[PDB]
Amino acid sequence: KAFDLVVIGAGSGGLEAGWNAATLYGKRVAVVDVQTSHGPPFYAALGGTCVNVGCVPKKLMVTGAQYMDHLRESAGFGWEFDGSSVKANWKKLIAAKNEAVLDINKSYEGMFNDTEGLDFFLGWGSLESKNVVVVRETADPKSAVKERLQADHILLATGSWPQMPAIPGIEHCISSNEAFYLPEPPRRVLTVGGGFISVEFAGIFNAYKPPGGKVTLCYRNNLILRGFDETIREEVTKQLTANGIEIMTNENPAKVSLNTDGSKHVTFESGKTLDVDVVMMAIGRIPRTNDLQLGNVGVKLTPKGGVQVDEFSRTNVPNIYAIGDITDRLMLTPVAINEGAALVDTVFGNKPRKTDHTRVASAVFSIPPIGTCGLIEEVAAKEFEKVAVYMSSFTPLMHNISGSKYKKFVAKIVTNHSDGTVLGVHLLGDGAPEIIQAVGVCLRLNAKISDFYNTIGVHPTSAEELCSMRTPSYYYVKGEKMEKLP
Amino acid sequence: KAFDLVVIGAGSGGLEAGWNAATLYGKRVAVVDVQTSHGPPFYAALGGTCVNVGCVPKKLMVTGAQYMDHLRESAGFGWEFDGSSVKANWKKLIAAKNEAVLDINKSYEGMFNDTEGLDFFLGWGSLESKNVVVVRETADPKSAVKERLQADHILLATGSWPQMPAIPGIEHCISSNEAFYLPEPPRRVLTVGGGFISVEFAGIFNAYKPPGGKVTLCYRNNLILRGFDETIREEVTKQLTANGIEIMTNENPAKVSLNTDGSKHVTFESGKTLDVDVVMMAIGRIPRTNDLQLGNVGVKLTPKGGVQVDEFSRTNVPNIYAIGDITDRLMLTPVAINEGAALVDTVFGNKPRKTDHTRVASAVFSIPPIGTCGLIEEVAAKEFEKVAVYMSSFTPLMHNISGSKYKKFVAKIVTNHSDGTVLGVHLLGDGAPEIIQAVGVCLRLNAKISDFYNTIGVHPTSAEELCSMRTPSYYYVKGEKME
Ligand SMILES: Cc1cc2nc3c(=O)[nH]c(=O)nc-3n(C[C@H](O)[C@H](O)[C@H](O)COP(=O)(O)OP(=O)(O)OC[C@H]3O[C@@H](n4cnc5c(N)ncnc54)[C@H](O)[C@@H]3O)c2cc1C
Ligand SMILES: Cc1cc2nc3c(=O)[nH]c(=O)nc-3n(C[C@H](O)[C@H](O)[C@H](O)COP(=O)(O)OP(=O)(O)OC[C@H]3O[C@@H](n4cnc5c(N)ncnc54)[C@H](O)[C@@H]3O)c2cc1C
Ligand SMILES: [Br-]
Ligand SMILES: [Mg+2]
Ligand SMILES: [Mg+2]
């Protein structure tokens, strides 16, 4: 019952910290989670949000969704088949996803049992005192104690949870959690929100919808995917539209009621109405701090609800650290992992290291997908006196043959024009998530635009566009966009 | 007619040099090629080998071939359709490819019309003298003169040509050139060679073959794709085999005759026989120097027939340069382009620059494909005292669901273990050619393994494997492999 490190949350960040502390530094580690395998009632489980109801299953379902486009696009290359026979069997997809996630859950179980001084505790972790974690049977602080864990160090890694807007009939709506377990693909679905989760699920539902189906995505402001490159936000909007998805911008649900046939009657703030079979709320995720009883040891939270941390993931309380989504910064699995690895290298390895939250490669598995690393130009333009934007945007030859002429591949490089330093790279198109990873390494190396254009292309690829851009398309000078420099 | 530059060969390297000299340096430029659009009789044409009978059409046809796998793989993700209705229509593929290539041909025609100081001449270019290119009706040097072009500077950029072994019945075989024009997909095809062209065409023919068809690839040596990472050579062999291609290693045709039905009867050196509809020779490509009459000016060739060049693409004759496949080095379109641009900057810009032929990213559009940049470990091990190999090799989760469980993604990083400098990166699997491009940029920046592993992954991707390898799988110490 005594440990060097107790981790509350067996997710992306918590398991990296846990495994590393045990296997690299022979430390004695307890990891707490509420559930050993995916799905209801608690959705996240051993492996965390990404494994159970996040990156892993989402990516398999987007891959499944992509076959709608491959089956159509095949015709341009001479593939012939009975188009009237094509069905998308959602139940098969969900059964395959469930088996894949369960196998990972079982993999993590094997990892704990195989590893000396790495112990999993089932139940709800909360802070009793500075050096004691209590595992209770439920999220109720008044529920039975399963365990009292003595901790030289405590890591909070409980991640996040979907935010459900407090509107009349929210109980008729789902989150991404339930989306992963729908018994039937909805004929009509409203995805609410403009972020990656709404966009990715709109794609998934669009491919698996039964005949006469309709996917509608609503967003409360003007243009989806705030924080992404603007050119790409506009293009993804057009390319989703081109594939049958209705993008309702400047619209937001005011209430939902059940129709007598069990469908949902959505009334928007605008007075507009829409009937759908499923309303999936994807308007935000919020850190899971409530259940940890942070009032008990005085761990400070932010004006947004995330655990306050310094660059070393340290809270205001010595021996207590927080990584990943609970910190409410970049909600990405590899960031959580990086932070956990750095924390353990610092505290147990005597090799202090701070996660770099700049120049983080990331993706949206939209159809087609986004890959991005570093600053968008509007952000660069406020930091740097002179910013250059290099842009290539055209439909690749193969999509002129596929018949998907709307699939413009977008490649943008944003530089500090004073020294050529690449500040950001923004891609839209097939392969963009794969292309961007080694761009992340390029930015860590402070690559300049001349490092890209002096590198020999791989031909033919989309990626070689990044090595073909010599001349800025336009600039920002003291924040002002202009075609040409003074 | 008088030019600052005459380019013989309107291909990858020739058009880059001609266009750069004309537009960046305001030079008067002539460019010669034997055909204005793709296909028989000369196959290459305005735009070069890559445009007409190479990278561009082959990539379209591999993309077409990939649908065989997509259609089958869709089932695991719940897609249903009538499998018995599926037909691969090769005629539609060839038509779509032909339109794509002709549109490029036409666009280059328009580039010459609209670029003042850049003039296209149709016919066969050869050297009359060290400042005169003669353009003739045919490759025969006795054929009619169409033009005589006075040149301050002459660029040889005629590319390469398929090598055909001198075996009995060679006339019953084709090369990649003719493969692009087969009116019907062969039921039985033997691709001869272990290089990328043989492997890429084996995958194309495997997808479009009619019912009950069979693709066989034969190679003289023990393991296809010499020059590539050895793990990847072994895995691509298994993955082709798993998709129904018969890999015949240690086998080479001795002769070909016609069966009474017009099919080809192949006899291998081993005595073994194989009946096929097409025999596609892809055993090599040789520099196209015969027709240039270089004996008129005394340009030095290698015994192979490549044009000898220094690092600045200069021949032994002042004012005569050679770039691209004619130099018989790295036969890649982007390298030819890089050499052309570096030559014109040097000669016309006085901006001295030579092409780095090291750490060139390249691809094989095998199914699944290869992306590679830099040294394989056996080469590194000879040049460096300690070499580390970081290796990740596993069937991605999506291929456990798709049912293609044979599709192992391989990611290998080779380092100078003394300082961690990345020497090579070798990938096999879906996306590899796209992943490897920015890896070329990393190697130009002398990236170390720590620069890869300290970069935060994009998840989930195949590419994040590159940023997840902290610990060598094994080493070479003074050339010897150590576990
Ligand atoms: C739909 C969706 C798609 C996503 N796609 C991607 C993507 O493609 N790429 C990407 O990088 N990121 C993606 N993310 C984000 C990614 O899932 C997170 O950033 C990551 O999982 C956060 O890791 P973490 O360690 O902070 O916590 P998590 O991985 O969320 O782990 C938290 C764990 O803590 C447990 N827990 C919580 N409270 C308690 C308690 N009191 N006691 C015990 N256990 C508790 C939970 O059961 C959970 O298992 C996605 C997220 C979602 C929801
Ligand atoms: C099947 C195949 C697939 C390939 N795939 C790829 C790939 O995916 N990626 C890649 O980078 N490379 C690829 N390559 C290689 C690429 O095609 C070559 O490296 C590149 O085209 C060579 O450029 P170049 O300038 O040397 O000559 P080329 O582009 O071959 O151009 C030479 C030109 O000279 C003309 N010519 C020849 N003799 C004369 C003469 N006497 N007078 C006038 N004109 C003449 C020809 O008609 C031709 O158009 C492939 C090659 C083949 C055959
Ligand atoms: Br061999
Ligand atoms: Mg254990
Ligand atoms: Mg002209």
Numbering used by the authors:
A (entry chain A): 3 to 488
B (entry chain B): 3 to 485
Sentences from the paper on this structure:
Trypanothione reductase (TR) is a key factor in the redox homeostasis of trypanosomatid parasites, critical for survival in the hostile oxidative environment generated by the host to fight infection. In the case of the Trypanosomatidae, redox homeostasis relies on the dithiol trypanothione (TSH), a peculiar variant of glutathione (GSH) in which two GSH molecules are joined by the polyamine spermidine. TR is considered an attractive target for the development of new trypanocidal agents as it is essential for parasite survival but has no close homolog in humans.
Site 14–15 is located in close proximity to the NADPH binding cavity. In fact, Phe198 is located over the FAD and, in the apo conformation, its side chain is perpendicular to the isoalloxazine ring. Upon NADPH binding, the nicotinamide moiety inserts between FAD and Phe198 forming an aromatic sandwich in which the phenyl ring lays parallel to the FAD. Therefore, for the NADPH to bind to TbTR, it is essential that Phe198 is able to switch from its perpendicular position to a parallel one with respect to the FAD.
